[PDB]
């Protein structure tokens, strides 16, 4: 496996870790996306303490309107964050 291929499996994995906690096992409810941002993206995103942040983040990501973040929606999220960090090497 290349670093890249592993990196892709890691993204699938982190998503599985949090999306299976509660509710729909294949999507992220707000609490899970919150726990995921706070536990796994602490160095890239300000810790989320206010509900209104989670709501706004979910509103951005939920493009099919079901109130949750499915996997493809999660990749879009990962591309945003990664694209923000990369400007460090713009």
């Amino acid at each position: 496996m290349s670093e890249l291929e592993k990196a892709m499996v890691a993204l699938i994995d982190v998503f599985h870790q949090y999306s299976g906690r509660e509710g729909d096992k294949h999507k992220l409810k707000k609490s899970e996306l919150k726990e995921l941002i706070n536990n796994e993206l602490s160095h890239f995103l300000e810790e989320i303490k206010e509900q209104e942040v989670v709501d706004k983040v979910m509103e951005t990501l939920d493009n099919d309107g079901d109130g949750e973040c499915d996997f493809q929606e999660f990749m879009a999220f990962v591309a945003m964050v990664t694209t923000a960090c990369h400007e460090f090497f713009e």
Binding site: I37, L45, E46, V53, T60, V81
Partner: peptide, 9 residues
């Protein structure tokens, strides 16, 4: 580090 709600696309 940035606030998560500012992320857009």
């Amino acid at each position: 580090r940035t606030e998560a709600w500012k992320v857009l696309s």
